[PDB]
Amino acid sequence: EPRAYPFNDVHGLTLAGRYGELQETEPVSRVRPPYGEEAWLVTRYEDVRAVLGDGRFVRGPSMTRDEPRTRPEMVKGGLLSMDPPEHSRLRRLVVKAFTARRAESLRPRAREIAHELVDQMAATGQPADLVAMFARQLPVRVICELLGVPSADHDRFTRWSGAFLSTAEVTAEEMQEAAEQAYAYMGDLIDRRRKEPTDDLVSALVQARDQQDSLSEQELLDLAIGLLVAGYESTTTQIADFVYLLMTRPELRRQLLDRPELIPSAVEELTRWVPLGVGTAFPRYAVEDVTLRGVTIRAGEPVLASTGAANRDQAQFPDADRIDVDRTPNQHLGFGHGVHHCLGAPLARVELQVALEVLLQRLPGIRLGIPETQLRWSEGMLLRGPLELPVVW
Ligand SMILES: CC[C@H]1OC(=O)/C=C/[C@H](C)[C@@H](O[C@@H]2O[C@H](C)C[C@H](N(C)C)[C@H]2O)[C@@H](C)C[C@@H](C)C(=O)/C=C/C=C/[C@@H]1CO[C@@H]1O[C@H](C)[C@@H](O)[C@@H](O)[C@H]1OC
Ligand code: HEM
Known part of the structure; x- marks a missing residue:
């Protein structure tokens, strides 16, 4: 009775047709994911x-x-x-x-x-x-x-960070060494910035105070490593996906070459359009019975809220499947919504904008060097994006 979930195929960025069907006829439905409990799935923009x-x-x-x-x-x-x-x-x-x-x-x-x-x-x-x-x-x-x-430490810190990518081919213990190196390095950097602050974020975290209160040593460390991992693969994947779309849709590349000032609005539009997750936002758990479009979600039950489907809801976005780099308004959920909305989003925006600006300025002819049908896609199962993007220019 619950449908097998995910609906998205990982081998591309297509939004599964099942989402649109469900937005019309069963906006709050049951799904059986590959691991974990069966869950409610919500798909309309309003409900997500x-x-x-x-x-x-x-x-x-x-x-x-x-x-x-x-x-x-x-x-x-x-x-x-x-x-x-x-x-x-x-x-x-x-x-x-x-x-x-x-x-x-x-x-x-x-x-x-x-x-x-x-x-x-x-x-x-x-x-x-x-x-x-x-x-x-x-x-x-x-x-x-x-x-x-x-600066001197960016290459090695990069090598350690790569072990946390969901596409890494590393053993339980190699991940273990990598995390221990990253955590020991970061613990020492925090200790150095406490003694001698600079203008960087670790120094600013150490000095932060709110209602007389401050970050403990353990919170500082967990936050620094947490920001790294939350901000690395996500952004990397989204850069690869945005450039894949620019290379394969000529009008998109043209518009951003002719009007580089449209880049920030294009980043918003691509964030809305690209169904980046294989599945949904992380599950939310009802604290009490909640009725959503007539369906009772009982206290304790999990809910999968698809921001992928939400951002492609024809009820919220006119012609929701068109990429319109000048779309206004554009209140997409691609950085989430509510108290957990992406805290890195202003930085993710700078980077995605910079990525498009610089690639287009330096390599305006950038295009795939293999047929699009031969691209190898990630099977990490969290996010969708190409494993390799051979390019020519
Ligand atoms: C908040 C800090 C936390 O941040 C996240 O929980 C980030 C999650 C991202 C939102 C996720 O993205 C979402 O996925 C969805 C499937 C789709 C979503 N969408 C497109 C709508 C997409 O937005 C994830 C999957 C992104 C990928 C790259 C990831 O696995 C990140 C893990 C980071 C964990 C870090 C925490 O770190 C761990 O802290 C504890 C305290 C440590 O002891 C240690 O263990 C350390 O260990 C890395
Ligand atoms: C394009 C890249 C990014 C995308 C698409 C993205 C998307 C998201 C989304 C959708 C959420 C909400 C998850 C949920 O509610 O289930 C989230 C949370 C979060 N993001 Fe990002 N993010 C990106 C980049 C970054 C960067 C660059 C950083 C840090 C530098 C970062 C740090 C975080 C953190 C710490 C959270 C949890 C916030 C909280 O729970 O209060 N993200 N992100």
């Missing part, structure tokens, strides 16, 4: 937004429940497994240090790093793999700059 925004839907049961999910292993802990008021305290302290101003201040360095990456990619000759050489490098290097990791 309601689930992500409602006080009655919590994340804390993620710590113990067999969470409906797409892989055998779990992704749990950190802010995304917390609820108000504990979540609220940690969040206030972080955003006091990790501001929209600080994200914007990283644009000039993000551009320098992007141009160095294009230098290095171009120098390996054509075709070159945009994923390994650019998409997998820019976000982790930008997080190193954000945090305050010295």
Whole structure:
């Protein structure tokens, strides 16, 4: 009786047709994911937004429940497994240090790093793999700059970080070594910034105060490693997907070459359009019985809120399947919604904008070097995107 879930095919970015069918005829339905409990699935924009925004839907049961999910292993802990008021305290302290101003201040360095990456990619000759050489490098290097990791240490910190990618081919113990190296390095960097503060985010986290209160040593460390992992693969995947779309849809590339000022609005539109998750936002758990479009979701039950389907709801976005780089309004849920809305989003925006700006400026003819039908897609099962993107220009 519940439908097998996910509906999305991982071998591309297509939004499964089942979502549109369900938005019309069964907007709140039952699904059986590959691992974890059967769950409610919500697909309309209004209902996804309601689930992500409602006080009655919590994340804390993620710590113990067999969470409906797409892989055998779990992704749990950190802010995304917390609820108000504990979540609220940690969040206030972080955003006091990790501001929209600080994200914007990283644009000039993000551009320098992007141009160095294009230098290095171009120098390996054509075709070159945009994923390994650019998409997998820019976000982790930008997080190193954000945090305050010295330049000299970016290559090794990058190597450690790559072990946390859901596409990494590494053993339980190799992941273990990598995490221990990253955590020991970050613990020492925190200790150095406490003694001698600088202008970077670790120093600003150490100095953050809210209602007389501050981040403990353990919270500082968990937050720094958490921001790295939350901000690396996501951004890397989204860069690869946006450039894949630019290379395969000529009008999109043309419009951004002719009007580079449309880049920030294009980043919003691509974030709305690309159904980046294989499945949904992380499951929310009813704290009491909730009626949604006539269906009773009982206290304790999990709900999968598809921001992928939501952002393609024809009731919210006129001609929702068209990519219109100048779409206004554009209140998409691609960075989430409610108290857990992406805290890295101002920085993700700078990076995605910088990625398109620099690739288009330096390589206006960038295009696939193999037929599109021959691209190899990630089977990490969390996010969708190409494993390799051989490009020519
Ligand atoms: C908040 C910090 C936390 O941040 C996340 O929980 C991020 C989750 C992202 C939102 C996720 O994306 C969403 O997925 C959906 C399937 C689709 C969504 N969408 C397109 C709508 C997409 O937005 C995930 C899957 C992104 C990928 C790259 C990932 O696995 C990140 C893990 C980060 C964990 C870190 C926590 O770190 C762990 O902290 C605990 C405390 C440590 O002891 C240690 O263990 C450390 O260990 C890495
Ligand atoms: C394009 C890249 C990114 C996308 C698409 C993205 C998307 C998301 C979404 C949809 C959520 C909400 C998840 C949910 O409610 O289930 C989220 C949360 C979060 N994101 Fe991002 N993100 C990206 C980049 C980043 C970056 C660059 C950082 C840090 C530098 C970051 C840090 C976080 C953190 C810490 C959370 C949890 C916030 C909380 O629970 O209060 N993200 N992200």
